[PDB]
Amino acid sequence: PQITLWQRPLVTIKIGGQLKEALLDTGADDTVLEEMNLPGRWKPKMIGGIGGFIKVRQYDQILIEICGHKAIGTVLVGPTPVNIIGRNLLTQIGCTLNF
Amino acid sequence: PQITLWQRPLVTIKIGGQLKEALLDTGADDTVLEEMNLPGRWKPKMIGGIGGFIKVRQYDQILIEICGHKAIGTVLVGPTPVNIIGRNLLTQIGCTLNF
Numbered sequence: 001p002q003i004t005l006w007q008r009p010l011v012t013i014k015i016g017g018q019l020k021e022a023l024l025d026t027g028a029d030d031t032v033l034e035e036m037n038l039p040g041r042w043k044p045k046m047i048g049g050i051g052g053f054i055k056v057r058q059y060d061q062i063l064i065e066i067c068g069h070k071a072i073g074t075v076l077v078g079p080t081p082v083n084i085i086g087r088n089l090l091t092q093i094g095c096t097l098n099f
Numbered sequence: 100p101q102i103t104l105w106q107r108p109l110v111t112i113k114i115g116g117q118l119k120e121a122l123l124d125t126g127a128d129d130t131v132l133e134e135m136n137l138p139g140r141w142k143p144k145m146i147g148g149i150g151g152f153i154k155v156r157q158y159d160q161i162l163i164e165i166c167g168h169k170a171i172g173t174v175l176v177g178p179t180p181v182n183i184i185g186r187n188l189l190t191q192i193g194c195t196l197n198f
């Protein structure tokens with residue numbers, strides 16, 4: 001699709017058989033989702049945003065379907081205000097910015 | 100132009116005759132630049148992101164040039180770690196997300 005930015009670019013994602021809403025965020029290096037249960041072991045990671053840093057759990061090789069496009073990569077879980085689809089997955093779905 | 104997301108999508112902006120570098124951020128509702136002086140009256144505002152909230156100064160009707168394209172809108176100034184071009188101005192230059 002072609003998404004305009006008059007509103008937040010929210011899309012439905014499916015992870016662990018659940019549907020959630022997430023933001024296509026070109027300003028985000030990584031993907032972070034609100035607290036949830038993900039399979040496997042996690043490694044520690046710190047991410048810095050506008051307000052400062054937070055500690056998140058890092059899971060590798062997670063399948064996530066974004067607007068019906070399957071992607072598999074690293075997903076972080078922590079105290080994020082919204083579910084964020086960052087550049088690591090955007091690139092897997094061939095998303096680009098156009099003007 | 101068509102911008103890929105292998106790297107952060109950084110562009111050159113021209114504000115108050117000052118030439119700068121900024122991030123095209125679709126995850127950002129507003130535009131926020133690092134501490135600088137704009138002409139006019141400003142209003143205090145609080146914007147929240149990952150890590151919490153920051154206090155910025157809000158200036159209305161500022162002209163910005165993004166990759167040659169002139170755009171007008173509100174510009175926030177504060178302790179942001181990077182200059183960010185949010186949705187309020189990406190819309191003015193006709194930016195869209197495509198996959």
Ligand SMILES: *OC(*)(*)(*)([C@@](*)(*)C(*)(*)(*)(C(*)(*)C1(*)(*)(*)=[C@@](*)(*)[C@@](*)(*)=[C@@](*)(*)[C@](*)(*)=[C@@]1(*)*)C(*)(*)(*)(=O*)[N@](*)(*)C1(*)(*)(*)C(*)(*)(*)(O*)[C@@](*)(*)C2(*)(*)(*)=C1(*)(*)(*)[C@@](*)(*)=[C@@](*)(*)[C@](*)(*)=[C@]2(*)*)[C@@](*)(*)C(*)(*)(*)([C@@](*)(*)C1(*)(*)(*)=[C@@](*)(*)[C@](*)(*)=[C@@](*)(*)[C@@](*)(*)=[C@@]1(*)*)C(*)(*)(*)(=O*)[N@@](*)(*)C1(*)(*)(*)C(*)(*)(*)(O*)[C@](*)(*)C2(*)(*)(*)=[C@](*)(*)[C@](*)(*)=[C@](*)(*)[C@](*)(*)=C12(*)(*)*
Pocket residue numbers: 023025026027028029030031032047048049050081082084086122124125126127128129130131146147148149180181183185
């Ligand atoms: O884009 C980004 C993020 C976002 C998220 C969100 C959304 C919605 C709500 C909340 C949150 C943000 O923060 N946003 C915000 C809002 O919208 C309000 C405002 C904003 C912004 C601006 C203005 C206003 C952002 C970004 C920034 C930066 C960049 C670079 C560096 C630093 C900072 C962020 O944060 N990012 C980050 C990085 O890249 C790393 C990471 C990882 C993950 C995620 C994110 C991130």
